[PDB]
């Protein structure tokens, strides 16, 4: 028996026991995440810990099989993924050290309460009190205090922690065949085999950077517009040819300029399409929302939800009978038990959200044919990108009129279109540079290119040169503002949002081009395009069996990211911004 045949037997065993154990874990997690109950909490911990142990032991055993001697790229990929043990190689001592550091950083983050000068008790935790301030306040001093306090009482505390976390994680990375924790994270995009469908980890840097080059002009003009309107709101502090203060971006970090819409609304009279009132009138219940979503997916040719979906999902808050976590989640428990958890209300947002989450469900149903280790999206962004393209189609007033939530005679005034596209811009085009800069700083820091003495300095240097944002109060290396973000303090990648964003518009433009739609890409409802849903399935079923490049080619027609779809989607807004910015400054001073 060739070592590969023995390998097949190994994996065929792994997936057979794993599929099961993961289903047991997932059912326990449905129990806890729904029927919050200490008992159920304890059972969740038990089952998840058994999953952890199984994966770890099977990973060691997989290492005892040599990847270099595996033929079928499919088998090789499953093995490779299972062979990536990670924390195992480090001594159990060092393991507990890093576990304690991650736990302590997350506990500092969660236990984050800053107090207000003049108030010895206005001290409030982050999620309850601080954010509203950073999103619905027009007081420079209040927002300033919040921003400074977090990056002061929390970032400083995390500073030594993250300092040692970098060294430990780097040792873990190089413990595996890796140059830095950066290369380890970049490997999630690394795939090999097939014809030229291979993507080396270091190519990710090249591609992210060139895509950001093409997106830079749009971000520049968006910067101008937001800057000028904010100037009129905060005149004493904003400079016309300068970067923007961080505390005025709409959230503690300024990851999404969405909350700046009231202060930066194009026009401002033409109301915003809110079918919410219409839903409230047609008595649309949560089930009706999800049923219309089902009808959409059937229209493009995709299947409809299992009986199990309608019978086992929690589509509504559990009245008052139980206590639940509301954050919307899509669930593939394994073994065909697909579900969705949401505290669905009667709101356009929850409607579009149901379409997104059900798109996740459809992806899950489409790759059930694949084995366990290949039952996932091709990269880390395929999934949420599919989800988002659903909401894009379900937001076009065309589809809103079809479902009967907007009168037929209703017409789109160019003004309302610009308003909508600008809101999309802040939330999308705003996080794009923020994301690039965050992950670049982390990548270089893990690569060591940024020494600790110039750790924070570079950070704000980039925040200005890239993001176009400036520090309100100068911060020394005593601070650690990067750790101030949950995705950074809790050891999570961040480039996923950038990649997802670039992907979703590529997908939407390809599929729309299939539906033979003509006109702006912000007006596309792939509804009834059997061919569109067919291409989508022809990718979705592939899972991660085939290279992510292959999935892309099967859908969009290219093997690598392309920003041209994103630009085409926002091009109207781009031109309007250019004209609105002619007699003003488009750019920002680096040192300011
Ligand atoms: C989903 O869309 C299909 C498209 O034809 C609708 O046709 C239904 O197809 C199903 C499956 O082939 C047929 O079997 C049914 O399955 C459900 C799910 O377990 C079960 O509850 C039914 O008693 C039946 O066994 C079904 O006869 C057929 N119905 C038609 C043609 O009216 C289907 O209606 C959609 N899904 C569901 C659950 O109805
Ligand atoms: C995508 O395709 C669907 C078809 O499933 C389109 O919805 C359909 O729209 C037509 C025209 O309004 C509806 O016609 C209706 O026929 C019934 C037959 O009894 C009649 O009583 C009504 O007065 C009306 O004329 C049709 O029922 C409806 N399909 C449904 C409700 O399942 C939809 O407009 C298409 N969307 C896009 C973006 O192309
Ligand atoms: C919720 O948990 C409690 C405590 O473990 C248990 O007695 C009860 O049967 C559970 N109910 C549901 C609906 O999960």
Short description:
This protein has 592 residues and is mostly helical. The chain has helices at 3-34, 38-63, 73-83, 92-110, 126-135, 140-175, 181-186, 203-233, 276-281, 286-300, 307-312, 348-366, 382-395, 397-402, 414-429, 431-447, 455-465, 486-489, 495-514, 530-540, 548-555, 564-580; strands at residues 113-114, 124-125, 244-245, 329-332, 338-341, 469-470. The strands form 3 sheets. A two-stranded antiparallel ribbon has the order 1-2. The chain has a two-stranded parallel sheet with strand order 3-6. Strands 4-5 form a two-stranded antiparallel sheet.
Please describe what this structure looks like.
By secondary structure, the chain is mostly helical. The protein folds into 2 domains: 3-85; 91-270 and 413-592, Neurolysin, domain 3 (Orthogonal Bundle), CATH 1.10.1370. Helix content is 58%, strand content 3%. A two-stranded antiparallel ribbon has the order 1-2. Strands 3-6 form a two-stranded parallel sheet. α1 packs antiparallel against α2 and α16 (431-447) runs antiparallel to α17. The longest helix has 36 residues, at 140-175. It is globular. It starts with a helix and ends in a 12-residue tail after the last helix. A molecule of 3 linked components (NAG-NAG-BMA) binds next to α14. It is classed as viral protein.
């Amino acid at each position: 028996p060739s070592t590969e045949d023995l390998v097949n037997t190994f994996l065929e065993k792994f997936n057979y026991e794993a599929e099961e154990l993961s289903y047991q874990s997932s059912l326990a997690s449905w129990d806890y995440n729904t029927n919050i109950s200490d008992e159920n909490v304890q059972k969740m911990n038990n089952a998840g810990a058994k999953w952890s142990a199984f994966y770890e032991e099977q990973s060691k055993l997989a290492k005892t099989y040599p990847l270099e001697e595996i033929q079928d790229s499919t088998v090789k990929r499953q093995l490779r993924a299972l062979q990536h043990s990670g924390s195992s190689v480090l001594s159990a001592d060092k393991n507990q050290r890093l576990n304690t550091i991650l736990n302590s950083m997350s506990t500092i983050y969660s236990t984050g309460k800053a107090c207000n000068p003049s108030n010895p008790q206005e001290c409030l935790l982050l999620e309850p009190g601080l954010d509203d301030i950073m999103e619905n306040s027009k007081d420079y001093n209040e927002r300033l205090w919040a921003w400074e306090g977090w990056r002061s009482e929390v970032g400083k505390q995390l500073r030594p922690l993250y300092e040692e976390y970098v060294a430990l994680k780097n040792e873990m990375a190089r413990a595996n065949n890796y140059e830095d924790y950066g290369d380890y994270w970049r490997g999630d995009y690394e795939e090999e085999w097939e014809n030229g469908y291979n993507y080396s980890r270091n190519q990710l840097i090249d591609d992210v950077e060139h895509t950001f080059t093409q997106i830079m002009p749009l971000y520049q003009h968006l910067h101008a517009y937001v800057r000028t309107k904010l100037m009129d709101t905060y005149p004493s502090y904003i400079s016309p040819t300068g970067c923007l203060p961080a505390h005025l971006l709409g959230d503690m970090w300024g990851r999404f300029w969405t909350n700046l819409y009231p202060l930066t609304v194009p026009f401002g009279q033409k109301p915003n399409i809110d079918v919410t009132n219409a839903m409230v009138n047609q008595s649309w219940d949560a089930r009706r929302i999800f049923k219309e979503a089902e009808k959409f997916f059937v229209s493009v040719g995709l299947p409809n939800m299992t009986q199990g979906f309608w019978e086992n999902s929690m589509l509504t808050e559990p009245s008052d009978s139980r206590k639940v976590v509301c954050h919307p989640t899509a669930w593939d428990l394994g073994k065909g038990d697909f579900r969705i958890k949401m505290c669905t209300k009667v709101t356009m947002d929850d409607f579009l959200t149901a379409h997104h989450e059900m798109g996740h469900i459809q992806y899950d149903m489409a790759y059930a044919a694949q084995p366990f280790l290949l039952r996932n999206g091709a990269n880390e962004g395929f999934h949420e990108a599919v989800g988002e393209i659903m909401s894009l189609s379900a937001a076009t007033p065309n589809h809103l009129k079809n479902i009967g939530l907007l009168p037929p005679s209703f017409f789109e005034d160019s003004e309302t279109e610009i308003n909508f596209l600008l809101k999309q811009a802040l939330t999308i085009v705003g996080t794009l540079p923020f994301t690039y800069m965050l992950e670049k700083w982390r990548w270089m820091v893990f690569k060591g290119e940024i020494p600790k003495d110039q750790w924070m300095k570079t950070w704000w240097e980039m925040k200005r040169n890239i993001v176009g944002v400036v520090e309100p109060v100068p911060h020394d290396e005593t601070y650690c503002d990067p750790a101030s973000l949950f995705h950074v303090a809790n050891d999570y990648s961040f480039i996923r949002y950038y990649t997802r964003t670039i992907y979703q518009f590529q997908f939407q433009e390809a599929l729309c081009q299939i539906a033979k739609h003509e006109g702006p890409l912000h007006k596309c409802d792939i509804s009834n395009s059997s061919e569109a849903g067919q291409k989508l399935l022809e990718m979705l079923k592939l899972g991660k069996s085939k290279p992510w490049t292959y999935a892309l080619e099967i859908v969009v027609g290219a093997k690598n990211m392309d920003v041209r779809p994103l630009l085409n989607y926002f091009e109207p807004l781009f031109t309007w911004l250019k004209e609105q910015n002619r007699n003003s400054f488009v750019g920002w001073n680096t040192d300011w």
